[PDB]
Amino acid sequence: PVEFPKSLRASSHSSEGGTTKEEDIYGYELLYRSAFASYIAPTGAWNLVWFQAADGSIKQARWYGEWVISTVLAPGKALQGTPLTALLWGPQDTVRLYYLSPQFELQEWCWDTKNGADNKYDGALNAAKVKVAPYSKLGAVSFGGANLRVYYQGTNNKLEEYTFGGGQGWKKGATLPGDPLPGTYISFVNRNKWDANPPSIRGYFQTVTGSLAEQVWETGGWRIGQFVIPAAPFLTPISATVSPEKDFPKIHVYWLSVESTIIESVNWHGWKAPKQIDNISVVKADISATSFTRDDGTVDVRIYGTAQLNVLFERIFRYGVWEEKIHSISVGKEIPIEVVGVAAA
Amino acid sequence: PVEFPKSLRASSHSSEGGTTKEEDIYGYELLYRSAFASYIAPTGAWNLVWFQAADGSIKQARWYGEWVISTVLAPGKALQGTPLTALLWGPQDTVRLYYLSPQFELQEWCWDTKNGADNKYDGALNAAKVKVAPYSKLGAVSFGGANLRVYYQGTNNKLEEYTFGGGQGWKKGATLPGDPLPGTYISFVNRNKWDANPPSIRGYFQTVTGSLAEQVWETGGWRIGQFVIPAAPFLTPISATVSPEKDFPKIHVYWLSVESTIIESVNWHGWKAPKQIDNISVVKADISATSFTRDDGTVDVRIYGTAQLNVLFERIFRYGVWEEKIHSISVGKEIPIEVVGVAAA
């Protein structure tokens, strides 16, 4: 078997007090610790997830009754271990996916489905040859329809913005405040509706001290926000998502604990205390959150990431509760392996 | 600060019971979880270590009274996250380093220093265009002088051999027995002297069940060896090294425990029970062991790898003890970060 810390739960079928003896799955055609991007349709009718296959291609898992896997970027297009982040607007007919080339330049993939067409092509961001810090992660938002913002870590470790819209093409945007940890995970969200202008932008990242911090664009340009988590694990995955609950934006910020469990902090008329959403230890690796508002005004959340041993998980917050059924999305060949919980020496 | 499990020690200066409050170093120009290859001179006079920088270049650390860092392969030569493994013979004037290209093909770098020469150049393996499983690790041995063997994981997850020698160039060798875990770490050693023919080859790897296993080559062919560790952490780093102690080959096999501490199994007139060499938790990432025999017949060992938060460590076994001082080798810019031990929720 493989050994796992006895005090941690490897899956939803682990013993209540930790891992004893169980079977878990290794999907070996998913890149180990793959990046994830995602977007659920605002109607909730279908789901998009993007990930990196072991061969380095970028693939898509789309749920519509069942999951369907396809390839969106051929092997050779993306850095092995590229970050990923996605946009969806129109309200839901135009997709952009951002990634890094093997030369650490910002790249853009476009998927347009307006009017029943289907066009897939490289975006113009590639032309700017934006060289980023090699460990940079990526975030992005859209507003006013096709006004786009891409956030990355520049070569001096500051967070940086690139802008698109208004017929201007891609142009360098702001340099953001703060002192980001080299290699920090980052996640940016727009609190206002996809077709609204101005946007209300928030970004989440880890600083050089290990704390978590917030970028705010509201009025008067970029400022550091009130969200402060004094300590978090080194290079903790971070993903945030926002949708209106009872007619006010509900920001959800997710990161990992030292036990590799998912911690959530909500901003909804103020920040609420961080709390663990479940006690199952995921692989310490990129996560991706998305959300939508139901007709009744409540907000559903989906989180994707890597579960033990190497599977793509889907965690579901629906009608106010995290469901205990945590699904896995198969992306290729798999082997089952026995897992035994082992105590410290 | 950054949070770390309170029950684990992040450094030699951590409290005896685990981490309380301390400072640790982030070398952000070392690729996070870099692969490592290494070779100490058979005289013990100097040391070589190879690693991947954050920018994807392959670099070398050389010790001869002091550590000196150099770049041996420019960005673009190696897969981001490439495995690495090294050879040294002549007795000590001929070096090879094996790695993967961004297209997952075996590559070979050569460094020849016979007679005061100083020639770095690409080896002939590159031209064979040998495509391997994208998550393959690498091992290698040399014998009879320049008879070389490179071990890798093929696309069907079997361990495979490529051979060089006898004026034949690089040719496909054997397919090895057993059922290797996809992406297993692998480490191969030659128990006989560098100029001796035949060799006595051992390889260590993890199987599809999570056990650790042994490949054996002796005159007559390959077989599965009697070394069996029934359970180990999933995708545990593995590195082995052999040198004669009192004229008998002393194999040292290293892997990581569930606490990310280094476990050692020695073969020397039989296998000795596995034992933890120290209680300091390393980053669960590639390690690299090397060894030499002193004039008095005793065997020194060096282990390189990633220590918290992201630094290149050197552990030293010398005159029969693991030294309490664990060194760090700076490879670029660094920031100090406060670390606090945190208990489970």
Side-chain angles (χ1 to χ4, degrees):
Chain A
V2 297
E3 298 184 317
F4 196 71
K6 186 172 175 48
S7 64
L8 302 181
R9 295 184 79 218
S11 71
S12 64
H13 56 267
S14 296
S15 309
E16 291 297 326
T19 298
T20 52
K21 298 182 184 305
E22 65 186 69
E23 173 181 287
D24 287 291
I25 303 308
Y26 180 15
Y28 59 88
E29 297 186 310
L30 174 64
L31 181 73
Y32 191 48
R33 309 186 180 100
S34 177
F36 291 103
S38 68
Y39 233 112
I40 190 164
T43 59
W46 46 254
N47 301 51
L48 292 168
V49 182
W50 299 270
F51 61 95
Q52 189 160 39
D55 66 11
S57 63
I58 307 306
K59 293 185 179 176
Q60 176 182 287
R62 180 170 187 270
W63 187 90
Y64 201 117
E66 303 294 343
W67 292 99
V68 173
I69 308 303
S70 57
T71 300
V72 298
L73 294 156
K77 297 276 283 183
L79 181 69
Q80 195 76 345
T82 182
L84 297 170
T85 200
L87 301 175
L88 171 68
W89 74 92
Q92 58 186 55
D93 55 22
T94 310
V95 165
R96 300 288 177 268
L97 185 65
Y98 301 92
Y99 66 102
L100 299 184
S101 73
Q103 297 79 42
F104 312 105
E105 294 176 358
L106 295 181
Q107 310 281 271
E108 176 178 35
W109 178 74
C110 304
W111 179 26
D112 295 340
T113 67
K114 281 202 179 297
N115 302 310
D118 191 297
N119 301 325
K120 299 179 171 75
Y121 56 98
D122 299 310
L125 181 55
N126 301 22
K129 297 183 168 179
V130 186
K131 280 286 274 202
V132 307
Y135 39 65
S136 179
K137 275 61 167 182
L138 296 173
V141 304
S142 69
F143 69 91
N147 295 271
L148 318 177
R149 301 294 185 264
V150 173
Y151 301 93
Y152 58 98
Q153 187 164 44
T155 54
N156 62 2
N157 300 312
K158 295 282 289 180
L159 295 192
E160 300 281 7
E161 177 186 63
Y162 241 77
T163 71
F164 182 91
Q168 300 301 317
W170 283 106
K171 297 190 174 178
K172 180 70 185 72
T175 298
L176 275 53
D179 206 353
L181 186 63
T184 179
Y185 288 81
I186 67 174
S187 187
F188 281 69
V189 300
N190 182 5
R191 300 172 68 255
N192 295 345
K193 197 174 173 179
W194 70 273
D195 60 350
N197 192 339
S200 172
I201 308 170
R202 304 294 184 269
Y204 301 91
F205 69 106
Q206 186 165 35
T207 79
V208 293
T209 72
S211 66
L212 307 186
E214 177 187 43
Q215 301 281 352
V216 172
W217 193 93
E218 186 62 41
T219 66
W222 288 98
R223 64 184 188 261
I224 295 297
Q226 290 197 290
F227 176 80
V228 171
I229 302 293
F234 178 70
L235 294 175
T236 180
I238 301 165
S239 186
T241 187
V242 64
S243 288
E245 187 150 274
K246 304 309 180 193
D247 304 314
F248 189 85
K250 188 181 183 182
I251 309 173
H252 311 69
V253 184
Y254 301 100
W255 69 98
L256 299 192
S257 69
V258 286
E259 280 69 39
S260 296
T261 59
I262 296 166
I263 304 300
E264 175 192 67
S265 189
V266 168
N267 180 266
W268 188 75
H269 309 290
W271 287 103
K272 318 306 177 195
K275 65 167 161 298
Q276 184 178 264
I277 67 174
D278 62 76
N279 72 346
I280 297 152
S281 290
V282 302
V283 179
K284 185 181 184 188
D286 197 39
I287 60 175
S288 179
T290 186
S291 60
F292 74 99
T293 301
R294 289 185 176 273
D295 179 273
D296 73 359
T298 63
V299 172
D300 268 43
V301 179
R302 307 292 179 267
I303 307 177
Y304 305 94
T306 304
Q308 298 292 344
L309 296 167
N310 191 43
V311 295
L312 164 51
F313 72 75
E314 182 181 43
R315 280 166 160 76
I316 297 179
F317 188 77
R318 175 153 52 197
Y319 291 117
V321 298
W322 289 100
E323 300 188 347
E324 289 195 6
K325 171 62 172 88
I326 299 176
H327 316 288
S328 55
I329 302 163
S330 181
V331 302
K333 291 168 175 53
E334 291 170 4
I335 58 170
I337 306 175
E338 295 182 338
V339 180
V340 293
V342 181
Chain B
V2 292
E3 296 183 318
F4 193 74
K6 185 170 175 55
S7 59
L8 300 182
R9 298 183 75 228
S11 66
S12 301
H13 52 267
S14 294
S15 308
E16 302 304 318
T19 300
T20 54
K21 292 181 174 186
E22 64 185 66
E23 172 177 282
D24 286 285
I25 302 302
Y26 180 13
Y28 57 91
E29 296 186 314
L30 174 62
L31 182 73
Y32 191 50
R33 306 183 184 104
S34 176
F36 289 100
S38 68
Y39 232 110
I40 189 165
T43 59
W46 45 254
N47 306 49
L48 296 169
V49 184
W50 299 271
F51 60 96
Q52 189 161 37
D55 66 10
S57 63
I58 304 308
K59 294 185 181 174
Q60 177 182 286
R62 183 171 184 268
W63 191 88
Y64 203 141
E66 62 173 352
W67 287 106
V68 175
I69 310 301
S70 57
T71 300
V72 298
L73 295 156
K77 294 288 185 180
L79 181 70
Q80 194 75 346
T82 180
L84 298 168
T85 199
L87 299 176
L88 172 66
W89 74 91
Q92 58 188 55
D93 64 3
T94 311
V95 167
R96 303 287 179 265
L97 184 68
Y98 300 94
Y99 63 101
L100 298 185
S101 72
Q103 300 77 36
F104 316 103
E105 289 172 8
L106 296 177
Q107 310 293 306
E108 178 177 34
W109 172 85
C110 304
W111 183 25
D112 291 354
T113 56
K114 183 182 169 188
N115 299 336
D118 178 38
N119 292 308
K120 288 99 163 177
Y121 62 100
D122 289 342
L125 184 56
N126 301 11
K129 298 176 182 285
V130 184
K131 273 287 257 208
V132 310
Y135 40 65
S136 180
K137 273 65 172 183
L138 294 174
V141 304
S142 67
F143 70 91
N147 296 271
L148 316 180
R149 300 298 186 261
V150 170
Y151 300 97
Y152 60 97
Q153 188 163 43
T155 60
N156 65 4
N157 300 311
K158 297 286 287 185
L159 295 190
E160 299 281 8
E161 178 188 64
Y162 238 75
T163 72
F164 181 91
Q168 300 294 301
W170 284 106
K171 288 184 186 177
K172 179 70 184 73
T175 299
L176 273 50
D179 297 303
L181 186 65
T184 179
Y185 287 83
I186 66 173
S187 188
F188 281 71
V189 298
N190 182 5
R191 302 174 64 254
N192 294 344
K193 191 172 166 167
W194 71 272
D195 57 353
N197 194 336
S200 174
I201 305 169
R202 300 297 183 272
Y204 301 91
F205 69 106
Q206 186 165 33
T207 77
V208 295
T209 73
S211 66
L212 303 187
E214 179 183 46
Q215 302 281 352
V216 169
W217 189 92
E218 300 283 334
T219 304
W222 291 95
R223 63 183 193 261
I224 291 297
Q226 293 161 210
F227 176 77
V228 170
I229 303 298
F234 176 71
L235 293 174
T236 178
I238 301 170
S239 184
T241 188
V242 66
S243 204
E245 183 149 273
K246 306 299 180 185
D247 284 283
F248 189 96
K250 188 178 181 182
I251 311 172
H252 314 71
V253 183
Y254 301 98
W255 69 99
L256 300 189
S257 69
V258 286
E259 287 71 36
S260 294
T261 62
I262 295 166
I263 304 305
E264 175 193 64
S265 279
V266 167
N267 184 266
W268 185 78
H269 307 288
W271 286 103
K272 321 306 175 201
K275 191 180 178 303
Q276 182 180 261
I277 67 173
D278 64 74
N279 70 350
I280 298 156
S281 292
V282 302
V283 177
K284 184 183 183 186
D286 198 39
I287 61 175
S288 176
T290 187
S291 61
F292 77 100
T293 301
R294 286 181 180 272
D295 289 334
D296 63 13
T298 63
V299 170
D300 267 45
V301 181
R302 304 292 176 270
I303 307 178
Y304 305 93
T306 305
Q308 296 292 344
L309 293 167
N310 190 43
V311 295
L312 164 49
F313 73 72
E314 180 183 44
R315 282 164 159 77
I316 297 178
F317 188 78
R318 174 154 55 193
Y319 293 113
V321 295
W322 290 99
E323 297 185 348
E324 183 182 21
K325 174 64 171 334
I326 295 180
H327 308 268
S328 57
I329 303 164
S330 183
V331 302
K333 288 185 292 181
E334 298 171 359
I335 61 176
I337 307 179
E338 292 186 339
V339 180
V340 294
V342 181

